[PDB]
Amino acid sequence: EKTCDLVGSEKELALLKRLTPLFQKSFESTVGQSPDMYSYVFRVCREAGQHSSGAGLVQIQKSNGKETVVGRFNETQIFQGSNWIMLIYKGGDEYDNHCGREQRRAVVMISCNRHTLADNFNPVSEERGKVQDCFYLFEMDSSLACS
Amino acid sequence: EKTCDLVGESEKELALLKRLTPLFQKSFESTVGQSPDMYSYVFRVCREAGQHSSGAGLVQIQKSNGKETVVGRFNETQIFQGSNWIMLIYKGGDEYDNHCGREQRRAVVMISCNRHTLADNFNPVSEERGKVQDCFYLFEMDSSLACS
Numbered sequence: 001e002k003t004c005d006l007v008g009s010e011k012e013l014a015l016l017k018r019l020t021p022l023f024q025k026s027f028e029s030t031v032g033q034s035p036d037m038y039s040y041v042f043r044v045c046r047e048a049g050q051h052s053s054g055a056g057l058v059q060i061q062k063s064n065g066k067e068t069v070v071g072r073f074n075e076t077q078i079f080q081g082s083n084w085i086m087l088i089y090k091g092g093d094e095y096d097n098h099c100g101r102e103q104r105r106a107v108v109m110i111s112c113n114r115h116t117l118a119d120n121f122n123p124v125s126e127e128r129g130k131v132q133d134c135f136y137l138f139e140m141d142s143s144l145a146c147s
Numbered sequence: 148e149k150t151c152d153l154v155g156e157s158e159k160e161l162a163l164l165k166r167l168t169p170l171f172q173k174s175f176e177s178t179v180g181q182s183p184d185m186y187s188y189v190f191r192v193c194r195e196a197g198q199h200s201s202g203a204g205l206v207q208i209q210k211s212n213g214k215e216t217v218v219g220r221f222n223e224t225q226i227f228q229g230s231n232w233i234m235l236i237y238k239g240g241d242e243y244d245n246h247c248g249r250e251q252r253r254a255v256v257m258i259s260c261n262r263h264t265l266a267d268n269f270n271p272v273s274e275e276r277g278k279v280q281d282c283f284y285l286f287e288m289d290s291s292l293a294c295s
């Protein structure tokens with residue numbers, strides 16, 4: 001029953017409670033093309049990795065099957081916007097390349113969409129092989145982000 | 148003579164950036180909190196935003212003394228787009244050098260689609276300001292330019 005732990009905020013806890021219906025869902029997306037193909041696994045307040053490292057979102061590199069923690073849910077921040085919700089997981093694995101040695105962080109932009117409870121999970125910004133944004137941004141739709 | 152410089156073509160960010168040109172001449176401002184801990188945020192798209200902080204794309208002005216904090220610089224811009232939204236980021240702001248650590252501040256502006264206006268409704272969502280210690284600056288605004 002390990003859920004999100006808010007970095008620190010109760011206004012914030014209300015937002016997490018609103019996202020409860022998504023806790024059991026799993027979200028995944030594969031990017032790139034052989035050889036350098038990667039796969040992202042995202043979950044709301046639940047483990048997304050296979051190394052029980054408390055990861056809220058992971059990047060799996062398809063050459064070695066290596067898992068990189070983008071962010072952990074025990075360091076969660078969440079904000080309500082005009083037609084969206086921004087979920088953030090901090091404390092991921094350190095970049096130890098050109099991006100510096102800072103720990104990765106995961107940002108998921110949940111747009112309001114009354115037609116679906118949750119869908120269309122897709123990466124927008126990443127630090128993946130050739131793509132060097134030194135920033136991880138994902139998007140998805142949810143009727144939960146409405147109002 | 149200088150405009151937004153991207154971090155790192157990409158001529159998608161480029162093109163995506165050209166889309167915001169009609170906002171260059173506009174000045175955005177939002178005031179928060181109450182006396183004597185009142186603050187003002189001034190934001191501009193690819194243009195100087197502060198009173199005395201050269202290169203700043205968005206500045207936080209403490210109204211009690213006019214002390215200016217650079218949240219982000221437009222010479223370290225990043226810009227992404229999604230379904231009915233565009234995210235503009237200014238990096239290289241002043242370091243927190245506090246409980247947040249010593250990373251540089253960054254300004255994240257989420258622009259949502261609104262066919263009723265070119266640009267409007269700019270205000271803070273997250274901040275490191277007074278008792279509000281999010282160690283993160285997120286702003287939002289409406290713009291027809293973000294309609295996909």
Ligand SMILES: C[As](C)(=O)[O-]
Pocket residue numbers: 026027028029030119120121122
């Ligand atoms: C988690 As019926 C944009 O790679 O879905």
